[PDB]
Amino acid sequence: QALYAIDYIKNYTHGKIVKSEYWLAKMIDLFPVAKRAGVSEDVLNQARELHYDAHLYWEWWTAENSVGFHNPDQARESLMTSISKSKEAVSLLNDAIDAQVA
Amino acid sequence: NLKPVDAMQCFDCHTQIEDMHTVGKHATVNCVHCHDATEHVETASSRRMGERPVTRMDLEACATCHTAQFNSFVEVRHESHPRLEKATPTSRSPMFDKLIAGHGFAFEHAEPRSHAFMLVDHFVVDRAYGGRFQFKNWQKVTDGMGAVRGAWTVLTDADPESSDQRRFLSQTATAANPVCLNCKTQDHILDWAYMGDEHEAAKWSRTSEVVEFARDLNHPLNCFMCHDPHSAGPRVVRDGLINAVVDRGLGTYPHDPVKSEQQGMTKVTFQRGREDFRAIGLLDTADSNVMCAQCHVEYNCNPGYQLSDGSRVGMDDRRANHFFWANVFDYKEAAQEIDFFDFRHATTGAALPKLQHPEAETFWGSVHERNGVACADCHMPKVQLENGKVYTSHSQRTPRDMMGQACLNCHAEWTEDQALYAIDYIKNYTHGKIVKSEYWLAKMIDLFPVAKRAGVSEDVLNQARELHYDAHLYWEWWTAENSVGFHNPDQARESLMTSISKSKEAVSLLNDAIDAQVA
Amino acid sequence: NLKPVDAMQCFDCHTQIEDMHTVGKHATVNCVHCHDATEHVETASSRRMGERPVTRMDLEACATCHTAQFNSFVEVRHESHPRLEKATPTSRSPMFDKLIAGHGFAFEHAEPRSHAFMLVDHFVVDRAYGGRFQFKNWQKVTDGMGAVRGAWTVLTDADPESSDQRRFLSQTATAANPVCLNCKTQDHILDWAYMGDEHEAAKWSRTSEVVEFARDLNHPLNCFMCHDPHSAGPRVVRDGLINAVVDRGLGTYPHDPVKSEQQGMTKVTFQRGREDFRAIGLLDTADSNVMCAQCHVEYNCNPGYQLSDGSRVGMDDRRANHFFWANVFDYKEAAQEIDFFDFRHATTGAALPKLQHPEAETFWGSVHERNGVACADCHMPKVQLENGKVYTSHSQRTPRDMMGQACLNCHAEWTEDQALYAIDYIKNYTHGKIVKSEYWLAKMIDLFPVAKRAGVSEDVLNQARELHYDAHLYWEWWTAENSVGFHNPDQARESLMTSISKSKEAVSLLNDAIDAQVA
Amino acid sequence: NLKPVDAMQCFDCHTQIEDMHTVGKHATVNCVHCHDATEHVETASSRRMGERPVTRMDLEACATCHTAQFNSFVEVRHESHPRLEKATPTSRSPMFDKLIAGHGF
């Protein structure tokens, strides 16, 4: 039972780490597309400021060795923040790329 | 200590109960085991209920005389890893987030775990109630017996003062609606009209505030979902299943008219104010294929859209509670017949179906189903005892835990390791084709933004969107279905090859169109 | 399928059953579960039985609603070695044949095995029925479930045409009599008057032909031996126990009047033809010490002789069914009170007692008993489940199989190995003193022929025979008692040292007398 | 907490201890680990003990620096059956009582 409790936390936290990485990667891959579409430096810098937070609130948890066990609520809140920041950056870059196309 | 009541008094007004109770194996089981009807009897007339009697829906109402079945049911399989997200490289759908983008399952979709937890897991998953409900703490995730005693003994509500569906944490969704609960509990069996239609006698319906409904529900998988409490005979209670089998006349085995007749269902209707209210389906035989199909099917239990005009189909529409009762190769026709799709893909814009755990529809026509094997033979076999009264195990779990009873009694030519090897051959092969299907779907999906920004025509994009529907259907069936192909390995193979073919067709269409824009 | 009967009509005549059934936890359990009384009800008056109703005594009557308890009971402990003779160097009593010579146990006395087998083992042991009864073949010795279904489903009778006790093989005895069966079954509970006295309404009594009685008996350790079927409350049914505790006013705990009052017994009597016929003892609490003491006691269940004049005491005498209800140090006085001994030693000629399994009387005053521990705590513990409804294990067996529940919940300071080591320290020490007691008894016994042949006086031989009674009592208690000292290690030690002291005194007496004859 | 004593002073009288202690692998192990000699040193001469010093004989005196050896020593072998009489048919000497008669064993 105690092992099962550990695994519930680690499995849940790892799922959110993987989703955080999915969204960070989606954001990262838009940078070359935005650059080559002629998106402004102003927009790219806005996305870079979001990257700082998206990265911090993800990497803390791949760096930290307990896969959330040491503080499961904090891991959850942080990883949801990472995903939110990446999603904000994805929407910013997608809109800017689309405006360049139109 | 219980004191028996005179059932003859009740039978004067309750003739259907009389006909069931006096004939079956509960003829000697007094009503007081499950009902407190003292004030009811004092106030009722032949057509008016008067004071509402109390009916027990707790599983302990059955555990008093059937401890063995209850204990086997409530056991927690700790090897069934809990809260394990499927959208990870080590689980069922490594590219799920890209493929499902636009759907609420992107917020969380874990592997199933033991039946004791079904209602609490429904309440706490990130896609359901915006994170409103949590276990009281992270220790409680282990407590199967507590969950069975009641969800609200182990859960907390972030805001008991409001009843609206809303996000309490950012990366959650509010997909839950009242239809979901029919596959988690039947505590509401006397408070919900057939199909969840509006009804004067129903407290709850498809259009209820789901947070309020949630608070009224406690027990998972009540014992009476498969066993009539009055006759003790085999039954189903799930409205969607009765509607498919009986109302739409599709039969218990839609591909086999003979087996449908031998192993059929009889709809029994109960009234309120002499108006039809609720129904059950009595089974000809104790057929676990049909019992388990109350939940282990592909369904609608959600709002969606029409394929014809794209208009919203809300919870108020009957289509929001629907059993398709169709195998993978008949599913598209079944969705077209009700003019329905689930979501638009966030990247491709394609109208797509959302598939869920179609074990029953997958099992049809398989070698085991054709040879008269049923879910319970592999997942809740009879116990083998050197000296003891045999009973049926109710711990519904993988046969890997009980291979002697689940497989080897039939397969005498095999050792346990050989039978496990045969399972793994099928699962490994099927999973390889799922991963390849996802690779090709993802390759197609990633071409949509490239095509859009290259100026590819809407005509071409819509052609690719129509292919996306099929590529998705013929893939997602198999990540949704829990056997990783074991239940029907040839069908999985044919379907997944179809998925790959459709994606490849779309990739070639989009690549050519992008290239023509460049030249 | 059972159809319920009108219990209220029965209660018009059966007022004691009414008072028990309507109040207890079987108030909702219809009489048809255990009685077929249709013709009885048609023909009875309050003063005449009319047609005799059928009463079910099979354990399956209870297993329908209490499968967990039934299955735990019927389980066979294969580690309890079967048909293992105690008179061997590797068992409990290496010198038993020399010491017991003249008694029927010299023909066979095996170690106990699982409760499922008690009636069949009683029927087939070489000392009981002259070898008349056998298992149908040697494979049937494994079949606990079959024995529980009924003895005559697994046994054969060498001569169904005769009913006399006789030898069918040379080295057998015919020690069985009707009193024995009271500790193997209660199938005869409605056919046997209290104590087995003659009664117009009793088919069977102490003086019946035991072979005929045997053929009418089927089930071992009926569930109702400890649980009243009407109230579901705790009870005993064994006449000899009720006689000791209630009739003779000894109390449930003869050494503790306070515990006797708190944990007492109430005698309830049933009549036939308005004369007392049978009785039960309702317990104040669910006290396994007293439930198990229905059988695990020292008793008379046999003819014997008077200490006063040596005259025969036959089965017709009340003393042939007797619970001494006395510890080892009170037993000689208890036997003097009824003027009784069992056999004359074949070699020494001494009047001797025969002791059997005095677990209950040994447990009194021990550290565990004084601390309120009871047999069930160590031998029938509650089951421990991660998730499940708790019930009481009915697999009455050594705590070595379930040390976590039997010992270590109380003894938190110990590991399993430490607790086992503590058991073994006691058993090893006690067994060593048993072996030394047998060495000295055997030395004394062997001097009797030497003394007789040397012309030693009858006066000296009689003084030695008096010592033999004590040397025997204070040894045999401990080969008869099954815990090898664990139940009361200080008492075992004191007693076995007394045995050795007595034997040494007799050896000295005889050696001196022989030496004086030679001089 | 132990406070070391001046071993050189002890050696002014205890020459055999000096020759043993200063040469071996306990040359750095202070006498206070095993002796309480405060009043002894105050009252002794080379020819009179004075107050008797306390000497520790408990095994914990060594276990402080040699826990591994101490723990391996104190372990109980539960498989070495306890209080098992040798004069039984299943032990070492089945006829021991007859053969040893007259002896305390």
Ligand code: HEC
């Ligand atoms: C006629 C005077 C009645 C007697 C006697 C009993 N009941 Fe009844 N009951 C009656 C009516 C008219 C209704 C409304 C439904 C209908 O058939 O028209 C009911 C309802 C119930 C229910 C359902 C309660 C709910 O929550 O929906 C139960 C469980 C019930 N009744 C049980 C019951 C029992 C156990 C009785 C004997 C003690 C009994 N009823 C007497 C009418 C009458």
Ligand code: HEC
């Ligand atoms: C004791 C008072 C009972 C309560 C409460 C419940 N059941 Fe029962 N059940 C009971 C008996 C005596 C029997 C007959 C046993 C036999 O084999 O003859 C039954 C039977 C069932 C069966 C088997 C029915 C069949 O094979 O036709 C089922 C599936 C069953 N019972 C289920 C059940 C459920 C789900 C209960 C809670 C709602 C329940 N029983 C209560 C005794 C008692």
Ligand code: HEC
């Ligand atoms: C005593 C010194 C403890 C040790 C060692 C461990 N745990 Fe613990 N745990 C302890 C307390 C007092 C609490 C809070 C209890 C309460 O109900 O208030 C906990 C909590 C947990 C939880 C829940 C955490 C949450 O965030 O809600 C889990 C899953 C848990 N403990 C598990 C656990 C495991 C697996 C341990 C060994 C690695 C462990 N705990 C050590 C007390 C102590």
Ligand code: HEC
């Ligand atoms: C019966 C037709 C069902 C309806 C309606 C709903 N669910 Fe379900 N659910 C069902 C089964 C048979 C299973 C187990 C098999 C599987 O593939 O998982 C489930 C599982 C869940 C789980 C646990 C796994 C997970 O996805 O995290 C949750 C959290 C869950 N279901 C939630 C849920 C919600 C929110 C529903 C309404 C939108 C819903 N379910 C409907 C059967 C059925």
Ligand code: HEC
């Ligand atoms: C459907 C998913 C089921 C639920 C929920 C419950 N049971 Fe069940 N039960 C099920 C099957 C398929 C069978 C075997 C039918 C066959 O003949 O093959 C059973 C059997 C019973 C029985 C009969 C005795 C036995 O075979 O063990 C009893 C008494 C019974 N089940 C009780 C029971 C209880 C108490 C439940 C809730 C804990 C329960 N069942 C749930 C299918 C289903």
Ligand code: HEC
């Ligand atoms: C034996 C011939 C089977 C029959 C009949 C059914 N299923 Fe099955 N199932 C089977 C296997 C070998 C597996 C894989 C198990 C493994 O450990 O690899 C499965 C899997 C499931 C699962 C997922 C179980 C898990 O992963 O823990 C579910 C939910 C499941 N099966 C349900 C199910 C239903 C509802 C059936 C009747 C329609 C059914 N199975 C039949 C073997 C067999």
Ligand code: HEC
């Ligand atoms: C009065 C008209 C009676 C009614 C109604 C019932 N019984 Fe009876 N019973 C009656 C008598 C006079 C006797 C003889 C014993 C006595 O008390 O004098 C009995 C006996 C029984 C027995 C014991 C049978 C035996 O083997 O000794 C049983 C088990 C019994 N009765 C059960 C019973 C039941 C279940 C009834 C309702 C269906 C019932 N009896 C009605 C008098 C009367």
Ligand code: HEC
């Ligand atoms: C189902 C129709 C039953 C049959 C046949 C038997 N018993 Fe029973 N028993 C039954 C119920 C519903 C209950 C109450 C359960 C509760 O906890 O509320 C009982 C209870 C018992 C008990 C416990 C009594 C107590 O006071 O704690 C015992 C010891 C018991 N039952 C024994 C028993 C025996 C020996 C039976 C065969 C003669 C038997 N029961 C039949 C349901 C049923």
Ligand code: HEC
């Ligand atoms: C209750 C007071 C009893 C009476 C009367 C009889 N027996 Fe018994 N027997 C009893 C117990 C508690 C045990 C188990 C503990 C033990 O020391 O063995 C037994 C055991 C047997 C056995 C099996 C062991 C053996 O000796 O081979 C047999 C064959 C047996 N008993 C036969 C028997 C006969 C023939 C009796 C009447 C002369 C007799 N028993 C009476 C409890 C009681």
Ligand code: HEC
């Ligand atoms: C098949 C080639 C067999 C092998 C190998 C073994 N046994 Fe057997 N056994 C066999 C038969 C056909 C019979 C007679 C069956 C009948 O019901 O008539 C038996 C009998 C036994 C018995 C009963 C002996 C008796 O005298 O009544 C026992 C205890 C038995 N067998 C055990 C047994 C064991 C332990 C074996 C492996 C060493 C074994 N048998 C081999 C068929 C065959």
Ligand code: HEC
């Ligand atoms: C005396 C030797 C017993 C016999 C024979 C049977 N049971 Fe029993 N039972 C016994 C004890 C000491 C207890 C526990 C009492 C306590 O409260 O500590 C029990 C308990 C039961 C119960 C209650 C539920 C539980 O605790 O498990 C039931 C339903 C019960 N026993 C049933 C039962 C049946 C069916 C038997 C025949 C197979 C049976 N018991 C025999 C003592 C004795």
Ligand code: HEC
């Ligand atoms: C725990 C404190 C105990 C209580 C209370 C009772 N007994 Fe016991 N018993 C106990 C032990 C440790 C042993 C030796 C088991 C071993 O494997 O070494 C015993 C032994 C028995 C036996 C013989 C069992 C066997 O050898 O398989 C019997 C028949 C027995 N005990 C009966 C018994 C009765 C009737 C009790 C209440 C009066 C009783 N025991 C109390 C531990 C405990």
Ligand code: HEC
């Ligand atoms: C001369 C002035 C001494 C000094 C400085 C110390 N000790 Fe001594 N010790 C002395 C004498 C004359 C004796 C009597 C034995 C003898 O050799 O004639 C002792 C005895 C001891 C003993 C043994 C005590 C016993 O129980 O027999 C010990 C352990 C001892 N002494 C230790 C000791 C230590 C540790 C000193 C330095 C702190 C020390 N002694 C000083 C004479 C003198």
Ligand code: HEC
């Ligand atoms: C710490 C303050 C120590 C106390 C108290 C004891 N001993 Fe010791 N011992 C100590 C050291 C630092 C060493 C040298 C380790 C090395 O390998 O360099 C030792 C050595 C031993 C040895 C080995 C001697 C050899 O020649 O190989 C033994 C056998 C030994 N020690 C035993 C021992 C005993 C029995 C003690 C209690 C009377 C004891 N030591 C105390 C450090 C310390």
Ligand SMILES: O=S([O-])[O-]
């Ligand atoms: O018997 S029911 O239909 O009231």
Ligand SMILES: O=S([O-])[O-]
């Ligand atoms: O959401 S449920 O269908 O798995």
